[PDB]
Symmetry: C5
Subunit: 307 residues, 5 copies
Amino acid sequence: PVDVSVSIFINKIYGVNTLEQTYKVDGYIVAQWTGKPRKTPGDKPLIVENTQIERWINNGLWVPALEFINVVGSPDTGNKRLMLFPDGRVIYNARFLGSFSNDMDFRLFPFDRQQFVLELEPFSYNNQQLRFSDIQVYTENIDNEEIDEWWIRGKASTHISDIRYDHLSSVQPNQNEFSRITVRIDAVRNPSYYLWSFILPLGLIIAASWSVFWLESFSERLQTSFTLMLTVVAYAFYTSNILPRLPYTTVIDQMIIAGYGSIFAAILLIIFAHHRQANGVEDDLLIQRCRLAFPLGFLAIGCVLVI
Amino acid sequence: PVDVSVSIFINKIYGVNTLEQTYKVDGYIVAQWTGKPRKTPGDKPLIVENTQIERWINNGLWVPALEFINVVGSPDTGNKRLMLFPDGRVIYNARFLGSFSNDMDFRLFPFDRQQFVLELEPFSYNNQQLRFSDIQVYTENIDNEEIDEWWIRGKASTHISDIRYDHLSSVQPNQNEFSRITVRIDAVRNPSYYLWSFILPLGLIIAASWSVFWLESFSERLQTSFTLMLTVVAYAFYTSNILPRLPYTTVIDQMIIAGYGSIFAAILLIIFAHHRQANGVEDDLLIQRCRLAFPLGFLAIGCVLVI
Amino acid sequence: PVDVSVSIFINKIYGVNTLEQTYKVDGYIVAQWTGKPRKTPGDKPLIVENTQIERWINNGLWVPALEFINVVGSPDTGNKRLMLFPDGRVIYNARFLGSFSNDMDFRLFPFDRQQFVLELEPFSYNNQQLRFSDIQVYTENIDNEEIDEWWIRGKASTHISDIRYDHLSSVQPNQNEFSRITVRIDAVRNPSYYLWSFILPLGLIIAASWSVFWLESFSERLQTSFTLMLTVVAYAFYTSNILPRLPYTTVIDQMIIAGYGSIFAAILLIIFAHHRQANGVEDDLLIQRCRLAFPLGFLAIGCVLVI
Amino acid sequence: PVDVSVSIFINKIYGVNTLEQTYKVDGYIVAQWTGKPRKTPGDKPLIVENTQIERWINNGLWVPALEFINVVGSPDTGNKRLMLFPDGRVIYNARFLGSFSNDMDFRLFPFDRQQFVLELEPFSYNNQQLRFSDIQVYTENIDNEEIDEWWIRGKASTHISDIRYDHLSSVQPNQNEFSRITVRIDAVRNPSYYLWSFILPLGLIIAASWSVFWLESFSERLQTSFTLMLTVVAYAFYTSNILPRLPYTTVIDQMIIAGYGSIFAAILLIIFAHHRQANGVEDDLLIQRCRLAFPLGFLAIGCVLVI
Amino acid sequence: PVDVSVSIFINKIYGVNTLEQTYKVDGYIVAQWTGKPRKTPGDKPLIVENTQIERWINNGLWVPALEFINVVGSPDTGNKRLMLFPDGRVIYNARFLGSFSNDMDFRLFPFDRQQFVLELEPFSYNNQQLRFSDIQVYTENIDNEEIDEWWIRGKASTHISDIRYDHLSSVQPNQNEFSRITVRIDAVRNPSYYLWSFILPLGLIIAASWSVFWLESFSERLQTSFTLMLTVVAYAFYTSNILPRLPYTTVIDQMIIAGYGSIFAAILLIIFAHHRQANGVEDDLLIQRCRLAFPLGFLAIGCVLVI
Ligand code: NA
Ligand code: NA
Ligand code: NA
Ligand code: NA
């Protein structure tokens, strides 16, 4: 086989699309293998820039096509390099930018722990014709974390495995196993803005909706509950415009549903309080002392739903 | 004719545009036919990478252009492969990404059952010069369904048919029939988020609008109805920003129209109740006992409109 | 001159941009002319696929450049074909997708009748060197109309005319007239969603704003009118997010302006009713019986503005 | 030097981006110069289509690169033409589409008067090697103005000037002056939709906020003022979604600020009216007769801010 | 080594993406080095336009690839120039447009001071084979500042440094140091629109929420506080649509949180005032005189949070 050493430099990770489960990765890829010796002009190694590699390819130089498995479409290739040492080894350097797909479980959204995966594999050559010797990912771009949306934690996990394709045994007797490189970069979301601007106003609004049982008349309680329901709808429409459009509920979504249920239960209990009188001579006083049990029940509901 | 075996690998299906009735499909396409034998260098088969296939094409190698019938514009072709076995058979491998168009009936939106169709056909060669032998679509990318917007159900349906073009008989005597491959991938929408965040708050809001007949004064009922109508407008504007912009009504749209009609009928009945008095000495009491018939009538309306 | 027969196939029409007055058309274009006879390899006609037409062009084969006059920018050309019959005639087949511009009067928006125009003309050759013999547009893609945003009505109108350019007489003595093909495809908008979700809630909201004169106190009428004005602003912001951003008013826009004027006139008449008393001893009763003339006046205003 | 006559045809002007201060222009550019005579095949002039001009360029034909100075990025070049007359003169025709940048003062937004500028200049050749003889811009596409967002007024102003670059004197002794063509196309915005849907509802809402001093109780005036402030916030959010995102205030922005100040001053004066009583025995009657001076003061403020 | 003088012209800076921490820069880049003398045709220097530089590159002319380090993806290269003087020196001129990445601290958003950085470096050649002699950035495009979103202050700071790569010592003994050019362009945001349309209505709304303690009844104070909370939610949703989507709080965000806390504290103090009575015979008068201490406490909170 042919041994290839891979070095991957990460410049930035951005553009996390939540519905598409994709994200953009910009950086360099370095590939280095060894072939038959050639006589470069002079003792110095010969460097081939962009748009001159194809001349060497047409002349007969061997170079493999290293695609990304999880990239969506084609990467945006910048400058590309091919440096030909006279002892025999060839170094390929290129710059890429593309949308890379992964699973990215977005449940528990403000406190996510999702890793970014770059999968690399030769497009054509199997384990018997092309092996990956080692990969050292240099994700050295680590900076201050308070201005970063994604907190890159730890170091990039690198692994080399063999991938066997079951359909390729129809045309190939024993050589259908491909060498693959997988890169794991674990990241944590910056939770400060969401916690300070979405979770806390939800708590204040839900306590405001708790505050309806301190009124003295049934009519005032009813119109107060309707205005509170309008407030919750307005805040739901406010948070829908900012939060990602993932196809399932997050903590903020369940908190909004909980506030909806709190207002509906408040309406039901105040109506049942008003009409518990036998002939209209009783007062709605015994059951309306749930002002110190409605928030405790809501806190129990929250403690159940968080855990 | 020339026999071509097609293998299609599906990597991901995403980007379902509802107004345009299109969707994105990313994956590989494998084509395999047989020609005259050639002497490859050595006993091993010769592999042609990207941007070297055109040299073989200009030299005289025959390769057909397999377009997608329902793709919109041009697919985003990634790496492409041409592997030339010495016994005679040629394997073409390429990666595509493009927007594929279909019918995609979006009535009954949260509980959709819509299939994704990939239609393939040679661009130039008819049934007498190019036949498709068989297709085996490997849509093996099946994962956990609770984090997927689209639930890919079952297995991909594959069929090979002959398509006859009526206009081509003006220039061709008897050979105007083209071979086509059609692929069906049935999917079901993930209904949990819509059911938990849109259907249930609609029910709570509609029950809140039912709650106006439990008030005691005509004026309070009127201002309560106006605040409720504002709530329904706010929630309609909330759901318009999230739901797709399809050109017809879904279940949520008819539920919003039903809430509009409920509030308008409530206004009409409370006004007619207030002025049913002959000289202002009667009380609005007989007709205002529709507090237990307005929701039953609405439930009958819902049972009629759902079925 | 040289005679060219054109066949245009329409696959889909979509992406109607209202502010830009453009729309996307995807389909095929077929051109067929006749030249000097050539000896194709064998008795069968020779077919030239994509990226091999340029070799024949450089070798000396004549082929004209048929641009679209009203396309914006460049069309997205898919696969292209050139089939060379041995008797002499050449058939050019290509697939296009681009944004085509037209007038598209969007007044009376829900009940529009706007035609989609494709204009075709040789880029270089005039009437004396290139004539269009006939065009038969095959817009055969006609389906069920209840799931289509645009109802394609009738058949495509085809016409061939000569276009004379006045500036080209400065360099050319008598040959400055170009042959042009114009295609008309008339379409009608699907009006069901707009009529059921925008026109009807406007009528319900305007009748609700009519309902303020049935109150009994001046203060209640004032706060009711202010809440109704907030409702109209909310619904205006709701319909602005969905309706197209054309630079002039549609029926919904004039209906919103009419509701604005209704609420303002209601405020003015209730204030003038309250202060028509000489010393505060009169009652606001004679002029407040406009509860059955304010909607009739609004209906007259609507009947005037619709016609 | 070499004389070049330029003819520019404007097809459409659209896509005015206000924050970026750019706009899209689609049309043709014609360039015509004269060189040494050549023997075309036959007496007829030889026409070079697209993708064959580069063959003539490589063979030795001289053609200059005419860039647009104010275009952003690269124009989207459609079909290009090169027609070679046998007497010696060469005509270059090409189609362009790109984003052109200008100043475009967007103060006084509904009644704007902004011109669209296309600047043209050779990329390489100075005044001593390439001169522009004359330009005649054919902006003949003039149509009915009631369906056009931008009213193209008058005729295109054309001027040819010499541009001297001060840095190029470091490498060039006396030849650093470049010939430039500047085109002015003055346009007026269509003000009907903004005036009918934004200015008039602002006036109605501001008169509604004027209407609070006709109430009889301090509490009713306070809650009415708070509901009016909510109405103004809602309308501000309504107009923010539609109006352009220019970095400074327009007439609508100052009108919204004026309404904000009107409601705040109303709150301050009603509170100061309620507590001007010495011991609560006086009535808030002398200062509350500003119902006919608050709108006059606002009209004076408007007359000052408009002029 | 080889000395290269760089001249960079800035045409416009726009498109500041806050979440991506990128921005667009359009302009020219001039590179000038010296090589072996060549015999140009005639005494005049020979100019190579676009799409003819590759012919000289294939023939053997040396030209380096100067990439931008911080550009995202590939720049949109317009026309490119190569002018070959006969004494030996070569001038390379090209036009670029791309998204350049930087840190761009967006804390204290309306009064930002952020610099735009362009980093330039040869793609292949180190300090021993390619040195940058000097750079003179001509950012001469300075205009009136009242219509500019970004106020370009001062002059562009230029610096040339050597960058040493630690990984390249594995293949290179002593030559792993690269020459880099860094350009600083400091800019100040235009703060007038934000200060006049966001900060001032926040102050008016917060003073309106201060105004609740001047009411006379506990119920009126409660419903007034709920309407005020709805107003704050509406204004929060209004400012979320316009302000950038940076992942942390700005001054407007903390002001909105402060208004939320003010309304919640007002609700808590009025409820505690109502129920401080021993048997309902006391009046809520001693603690309700915080009408002149609630705004002073808020002003102290603002003075603490601003500093
Ligand atoms: Na609202
Ligand atoms: Na919105
Ligand atoms: Na929006
Ligand atoms: Na209210």
